[PDB]
Amino acid sequence: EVQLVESGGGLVQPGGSLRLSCTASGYTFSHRYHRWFRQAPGKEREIVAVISQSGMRTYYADSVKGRFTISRDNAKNTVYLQMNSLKPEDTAMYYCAAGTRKNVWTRQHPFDYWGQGTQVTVSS
Numbered sequence: 063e064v065q066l067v068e069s070g071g072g073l074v075q076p077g078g079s080l081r082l083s084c085t086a087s088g089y090t091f092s093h094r095y096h097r098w099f100r101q102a103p104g105k106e107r108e109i110v111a112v113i114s115q116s117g118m119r120t121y122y123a124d125s126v127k128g129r130f131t132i133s134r135d136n137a138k139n140t141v142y143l144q145m146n147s148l149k150p151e152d153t154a155m156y157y158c159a160a161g162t163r164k165n166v167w168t169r170q171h172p173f174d175y176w177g178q179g180t181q182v183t184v185s186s
Contacts, residue, residue, distance in 0.1 A: 064088035064174035066096075068158055071180025074148050078184065082143040084158035084177045091139040092116075094175065095163050098132060098143040100154035100182070109166060110156075111143055125151070148184040155179045 070082035082098065085091075095114055101107040111132035112121040120132050129147040134140065141158055160175030161167045168175050 064171065066158055066160055066175045066177050068177030068180055071156065071182045073181075073183045073185060075185055076149055078148045079144070079146040080148065080182055082145065082156055082158065082180060082182070084141050086139040086141075086160065086175070089160065089175060091134075091141075091160070092136040094160035094168070096132070096134060096141040097159050097161060097166050098130075098141075098156055099159065099166060100152075100156045102154040105154070108154075113141060114163065145182065148182070150184050150186045153183045154181075156182050 065087045066084045067087060068084045070080060072080060074080055092115055097109050097112045099107055099109040108123055110123040110126045111130055113132045113134050117134045131144040133142045157179045158177040159166050
């Protein structure tokens with residue numbers, strides 16, 4: 063069975079920090095780029111962070127640059143999103159996904175590499 067199992071999230075005050083994780087099962091985690099994206103009701107989806115297989119390449123949405131850090135531990139099959147300096151505009155459902163270097167989703171059975179999502183809310 064293949065899954066990317068997400069955890070973390072919650073409600074914090076502006077300036078707060080949260081760490082999200084996702085842990086892969088049933089697929090080789092180290093073979094895939096992973097990303098975090100978020101979606102709020104009333105805002106469109108946004109990829110906020112991308113990490114390459116080895117973790118050597120990380121890219122960030124400008125809006126989270128220097129506040130969020132994507133990292134991974136291939137040994138633990140786990141990708142992280144460290145979200146520091148949270149702001150109200152960070153409020154959203156956050157999802158991790160394994161994908162390709164080009165794309166947020168894998169080419170097939172993409173739902174198998176997609177975290178269920180966790181709410182992150184930064185109170186105003």
